[PDB]
């Protein structure tokens, strides 16, 4: 019966979780999925989370379904930490925002509307991106091509080559664009690039997609949104996918928005209708409890300013780990340069190491990287470093 | 930028969520969403349930993703409730299962992965059957109709016609069916009837697609699941998705399960890892909260048999209200046939009002059925039978 379908290869970042699991090594050490983890490699429970589940669950309640689009305290929770607490947009009711299952439900949501609505319009992510994003939208049947980004030459962007790539393109083609943090490679667009961006995308007439999934974790919140709220108050028609994973250290319970900012409140109400309709026929509503959680934190005061001090910590603990091992590289291999790992912002590095030598990180030493050279910062800590420094230094003696 | 997009009318079932909510008629009755609620009109924390929560928050744990598939308890619980404890098919390792967002996400990676790997598969669904089948399965760019079902003269299954229509279609067409308690006429096949479908099913190669969603408020859970296990008996390519919702009473937390019959052990290998796949590139890994209670429930033997008598508890509701109500409207209009009331399972009556008589109950009563004339049994109590009854004898009166 079902001979003709394929094996499943695995993901490039989940497929290593099981193999990290089963390594019988002692000292091995992961540095693959995204994952933050504290200063004795655990992952943390945040006390504002902590706070919240309390609450949840006292007294357990009646557990109806959440509206098509979750519940209006998370809707508000996403929409003021991407465009600012009483941002005009919001205040002139610009903006259709829905919770979905994490980051990825809404860009499937996003994907979903863009093929039904644009079913002309093509996507491009950068060069590299998370492999996801190229697998959630050709999922939905949309033509996926690349824009030039990331220059392994100089390690930082191909600036001028990915403006000349954006003015080829069409009215409403759409473009995947991290605002800060890139996954995979850290490597961010400066605030006078952004602004030339938006520019081109704005001539252009193209549709910008922002997927966020690490603000805080780059300079602050507000910072981080840069180019989100330059896009709004350059009237552009902006998508917006977050995630509350990692910056609430809550993965598995699969919190995230979408968030499309229209010109009128007509276009608005069209647009959340159509969203609501989208997330109708792929699974009806969104999870109570990460719901109430993002709702609870997000919405009050004392838990808000709890939390972002806490993301804050998480920020500060990557930011030591990228200057501590500089440090040890620099020291170990004489003039050879490091700076990558304290331009590179928010969990990741790229360190160009080639996949040969991110598969015997693996095999000789236990150390779990992403195939492309991509590098989880918060995997490492005071008990891990030198041994993976060591480790790069034998593999990079080539 | 969005003139283009069409309002959403909203869904027939909870389009009527926020209206009934609304509503200042102080004797408004919901009969719309399949919703059990108690005597009271309120809507249970089951016992089971709320020990599981207990236990998840004692101590509040980190949270990680889940598997791609949900937790291995989660798919062990839903294989274990849909083809019998230790059953052949299971202990031959015969059947790959992922935990879902709610049955609608089963039913959407099932339709996904159909249309990835069946592309050329038509899907049909019964007429009448739950709307948001045919919006999941034409949101996957699949092409749908109906086969005949509900016989409007009759109030039984038009059996010869529906058999008539399946002996037209191609190796490899889906079948949409409801093993029991069908939604939304409530009208359900004999065993002898299902026997006669499946060696139709087999003789013509169509792939049957079971959606499960009130397992246990028909007869029993075995009986309930009995074109399940005929299927899987009969070697047949069946699909099952089903639900934790109504019958954990657990709507908001998105728990369901999707799995794939399959005839060796490297076909269930090769259809597991591409619903892996599927379920990444929609929305990575499903729920913690839910697939932690529905694993403690399912596999802890005292809260599963606490379980199951609290389902029983609900389904005995149920039939307490298809007896009261038929009683009632036999007496109030005599000689006129309420047979239907208690000949049909589940959750769902089939009321066989116009749209316009449903239409007239929600405004002069505040009564909410479905516009296809659908009545949610659990909806009725002591405290309005005798209103709904007198309404329904107005509205009758034509
Ligand atoms: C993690 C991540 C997501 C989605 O993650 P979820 O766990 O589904 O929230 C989306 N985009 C980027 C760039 C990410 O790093
Ligand atoms: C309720 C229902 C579903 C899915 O419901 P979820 O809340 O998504 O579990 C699927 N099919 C049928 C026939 C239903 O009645």
Same mark, same amino acid.
């Given at each position: 019966?079902?001979?003709?379908?394929?094996y499943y290869?695995?993901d490039?970042?989940?497929?290593?979780?099981?193999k990290?699991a089963?390594?019988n090594?002692?000292?091995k050490?992961?540095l693959?999925?995204?994952?933050?983890?504290?200063?004795?490699?655990?992952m943390?429970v945040?006390d504002?989370?902590?706070?919240?589940?309390?609450?949840?669950?006292?007294?357990?309640?009646?557990?109806?379904?959440?509206?098509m689009?979750?519940?209006?305290?998370?809707?508000?929770?996403?929409?003021?930490?991407l465009?600012?607490?009483?941002?005009?947009?919001?205040?002139?009711?610009?903006?259709?925002t829905?919770?979905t299952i994490g980051?990825?439900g809404?860009?499937?949501?996003?994907?979903e509307?863009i093929?039904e609505w644009?079913?002309?319009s093509?996507?491009?992510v950068?060069?590299?991106?998370?492999?996801?994003?190229?697998?959630? !939208?050709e999922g939905?049947?949309?033509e +996926?091509?690349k824009?030039?980004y990331?220059?392994?030459?100089? =390690? /930082?962007?191909?600036? @001028?080559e990915?403006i000349?790539?954006?003015e080829?393109?069409?009215?409403?083609?759409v473009?995947?664009l991290?605002?800060?943090?890139?996954?995979?490679?850290?490597?961010?667009?400066?605030?006078?690039?952004?602004?030339?961006?938006?520019?081109?995308?704005?001539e252009?007439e193209?549709?910008?997609?922002?997927?966020?999934?690490?603000?805080?974790?780059?300079?602050?919140?507000?910072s981080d949104?840069?180019?989100?709220?330059?896009?709004?108050?350059?009237?552009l028609?902006?998508?917006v996918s977050?995630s509350?994973?990692?910056?609430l250290?809550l993965?598995?319970?699969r919190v995230?928005?979408?968030?499309?900012?229209c010109?009128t409140?007509?276009?608005?109400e069209?647009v !959340?209708?159509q969203?609501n309709s989208? +997330?109708?026929?792929?699974?009806?509503?969104?999870p109570?409890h =990460? /719901?109430?959680?993002? @709702?609870?934190?997000?919405?009050?005061?004392?838990?808000?300013?709890?939390?972002?001090?806490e993301?804050?910590?998480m920020?500060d603990r990557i930011?030591?780990?990228?200057?501590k091992?500089?440090s040890?590289?620099?020291?170990k291999?004489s003039?050879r340069?490091?700076?990558?790992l304290?331009?590179?912002?928010?969990?990741?590095?790229?360190?160009?190491?080639?996949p040969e030598q991110?598969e015997?990180?693996?095999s000789?030493?236990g150390i779990?990287?992403?195939?492309?050279?991509?590098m989880?910062v918060?995997?490492?800590?005071?008990?891990?470093?030198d041994?993976?420094?060591?480790?790069?230094?034998?593999?990079?003696?080539?």
């Amino acid at each position: 019966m079902f001979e003709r379908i394929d094996y499943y290869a695995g993901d490039p970042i989940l497929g290593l979780v099981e193999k990290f699991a089963a390594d019988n090594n002692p000292d091995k050490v992961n540095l693959g999925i995204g994952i933050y983890y504290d200063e004795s490699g655990v992952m943390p429970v945040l006390d504002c989370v902590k706070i919240a589940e309390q609450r949840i669950a006292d007294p357990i309640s009646p557990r109806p379904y959440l509206p098509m689009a979750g519940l209006p305290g998370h809707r508000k929770g996403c929409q003021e930490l991407l465009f600012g607490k009483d941002a005009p947009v919001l205040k002139d009711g610009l903006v259709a925002t829905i919770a979905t299952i994490g980051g990825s439900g809404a860009l499937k949501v996003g994907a979903e509307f863009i093929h039904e609505w644009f079913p002309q319009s093509k996507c491009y992510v950068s060069d590299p991106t998370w492999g996801n994003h190229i697998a959630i !939208f050709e999922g939905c049947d949309i033509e +996926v091509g690349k824009y030039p980004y990331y220059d392994t030459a100089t =390690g /930082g962007i191909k600036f @001028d080559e990915m403006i000349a790539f954006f003015e080829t393109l069409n009215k409403d083609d759409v473009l995947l664009l991290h605002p800060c943090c890139h996954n995979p490679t850290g490597v961010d667009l400066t605030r006078e690039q952004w602004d030339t961006v938006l520019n081109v995308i704005q001539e252009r007439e193209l549709i910008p997609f922002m997927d966020i999934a690490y603000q805080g974790f780059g300079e602050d919140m507000d910072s981080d949104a840069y180019a989100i709220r330059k896009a709004v108050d350059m009237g552009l028609p902006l998508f917006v996918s977050n995630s509350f994973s990692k910056n609430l250290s809550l993965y598995g319970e699969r919190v995230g928005g979408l968030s499309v900012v229209c010109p009128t409140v007509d276009e608005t109400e069209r647009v !959340f209708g159509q969203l609501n309709s989208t +997330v109708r026929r792929i699974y009806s509503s969104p999870p109570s409890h =990460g /719901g109430r959680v993002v @709702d609870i934190v997000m919405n009050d005061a004392a838990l808000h300013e709890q939390w972002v001090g806490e993301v804050y910590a998480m920020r500060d603990r990557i930011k030591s780990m990228r200057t501590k091992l500089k440090s040890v590289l620099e020291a170990k291999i004489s003039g050879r340069n490091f700076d990558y790992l304290t331009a590179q912002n928010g969990m990741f590095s790229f360190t160009g190491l080639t996949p040969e030598q991110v598969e015997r990180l693996q095999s000789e030493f236990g150390i779990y990287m992403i195939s492309n050279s991509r590098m989880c910062v918060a995997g490492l800590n005071s008990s891990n470093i030198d041994y993976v420094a060591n480790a790069m230094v034998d593999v990079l003696k080539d």
